[PDB]
Amino acid sequence: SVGGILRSTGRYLVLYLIIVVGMAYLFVRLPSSFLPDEDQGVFMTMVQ
Amino acid sequence: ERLSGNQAPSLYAISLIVVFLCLAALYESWSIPFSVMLVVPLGVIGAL
Amino acid sequence: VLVALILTPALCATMLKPIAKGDHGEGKKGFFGWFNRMFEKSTHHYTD
Amino acid sequence: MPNFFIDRPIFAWVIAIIIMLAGGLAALKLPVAQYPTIAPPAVTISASY
Ligand SMILES: CCCCCCCCCCCCO[C@@H]1O[C@H](CO)[C@@H](O[C@H]2O[C@H](CO)[C@@H](O)[C@H](O)[C@H]2O)[C@H](O)[C@H]1O
Ligand SMILES: CCCCCCCCCC[N+](C)(C)[O-]
Ligand SMILES: CCCCCCCCCCCC
Ligand SMILES: CCCCCCCCCCCC
Ligand SMILES: CCCCCCCCCCCC
Ligand SMILES: CCCCCCCCCC
Ligand SMILES: CCCCCC
Ligand SMILES: CCCCCC
């Protein structure tokens, strides 16, 4: 399979630039946070 | 929030450059390092 | 001392021009020719 | 060690660039002053009658 891939080269350079553009796309759209807000078996209710 | 913020590209830029240099020392080549460093997107795409 | 043991030898071996046997820069023209003649002369004075 | 880096000039260059990057980055975020703390520390008790 790889023996065949190494005769192609140029086809797989395009696949790579697609993967990079795909990666670059997903990274920008994926929202960022710091640390997940975890359930800790407790919480409080303020009455004011 | 006011005292600095987002020094991540700054630090991951020099992280790439030090990885490049270390590989350059490993192979004794300014070019062969790229054959390793191009796999970075292959992992990131699946995570994303 | 680390630079003189690591980098300086690497630079001397790669990016330093070959000096022909006998040449002490006396053959050079302009100021440096005079300085090399003066210094090689003063080196003989000093040793004697 | 010198013989090692005569044959491996890129390795020799890599050590030099990392030291310079490490230094340059450290230099930017160092404090600036005329002197360090050279004067000995002093405590004062202030009372009033
Ligand atoms: C699933 C993730 C999707 C992203 C892409 C992942 C990479 C693709 C998966 C590996 C598949 C490679 O499959 C491999 O392809 C090459 C051609 O490219 C074939 O190679 C064939 O064609 C080439 C030229 O066209 C000939 O020189 C070669 O002698 C012939 O055998 C191999 O016989 C095949 O086994
Ligand atoms: C700033 C310190 C740099 C470390 C240099 C590492 C030297 C490796 C050379 C090994 N050897 C002696 C066998 O040549
Ligand atoms: C910080 C810049 C590093 C420069 C490295 C150059 C390596 C080539 C050596 C000279 C060859 C004749
Ligand atoms: C730096 C060059 C040293 C030159 C020394 C010259 C001394 C010559 C004096 C002879 C007196 C007997
Ligand atoms: C990139 C060049 C770094 C060397 C210069 C260091 C200067 C430090 C200035 C102090 C800023 C607070
Ligand atoms: C061939 C040109 C010679 C130049 C002489 C350099 C100046 C001498 C300084 C004492
Ligand atoms: C810092 C001293 C190095 C000695 C290596 C021979
Ligand atoms: C040859 C090893 C020397 C180590 C310098 C810290």
Three-state SS string across A1-48, please?
CHHHHHHHCHHHHHHHHHHHHHHHHHHHHCCCCCCCCCCCCCCCCCCC
Query: At what resolution in Å was this solved?
Result: 2.8
Q: How was this one solved?
A: X-ray
Cα dist. C36→C3, C27, C32, D11 in Å?
28, 9, 6, 35
Out of D10, D14, D21, closest to residue B14 by CB: D21
Per-residue three-class SS string for D5-43? HHHCHHHHHHHHHHHHHHHHHHHHCCCCCCCCCCCCCCC
For chain B, report the end-to-end CA distance as a whole number of angstroms.
27
Picking from C45, C27, C46, the residue whose alpha carbon sits closest to that of residue C36 is C27
Residue C48 CA, ligand 4 centroid: distance in Å: 8
Cβ distance of D14 and B24 shorter than 8 Å = yes
Contacts of C13 (CB under 8 A, 6+ apart): D6, D9
Q: Rounded to an integer, what distance in angstroms lies between the CA atom of residue B17 and that of residue B29?
A: 14
Beta strands in B1-48 (DSSP E): none
For a mutational test of ligand 6's pocket, the pick from C29, C31, C35, C39, i.e. the residue with the most ligand atoms closer than 8 A to its C-beta, is C31
Dist. CA C28–CA C37, nearest whole Å: 10
